Design a protein around this ligand. Structure first.
Ligand SMILES: [Zn+2]
Length: 87
C-alpha cells in the first residue's frame, strides 16, 4: 500500500447490510465522538464485519471480488481531491 489510504464507502442513507469486496476499510464520519473518521475496520480471517454505530454490515462474499460491491454505488468516490504524492 502507498500513503496508507484504505478504501472508503459512503452511506447515502445507510443500508443495514453492505457487500464489499475489500478486507480493508475505514468508516467515514468526519466529525464524530469516536476517534478517527469513525471507526477502523478490518476483515482478515473474519469476512463478516459490521460497523459499530452504523448498521452497515460489511459482508465479504466469494461470489463478489475486489472489482465488485453491493447494489447501488455505496462506494465513496474522490472527484477532484487528488494528490500525486507530494514530497
Ligand atoms: Zn461507522
Amino acid at each position: 500500500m502507498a500513503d496508507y489510504n484504505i478504501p472508503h464507502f459512503q452511506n447515502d442513507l445507510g443500508y443495514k447490510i453492505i457487500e464489499i469486496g475489500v478486507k480493508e476499510f475505514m468508516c467515514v464520519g468526519a466529525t464524530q465522538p469516536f476517534d478517527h473518521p469513525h471507526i477502523f475496520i478490518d476483515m482478515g480471517s473474519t469476512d463478516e464485519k459490521i460497523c459499530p454505530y452504523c448498521s452497515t454490515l460489511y459482508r465479504y462474499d466469494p461470489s463478489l471480488s475486489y472489482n465488485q460491491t453491493n447494489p447501488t454505488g455505496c462506494l465513496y468516490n474522490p472527484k477532484l481531491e487528488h494528490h500525486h504524492h507530494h514530497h
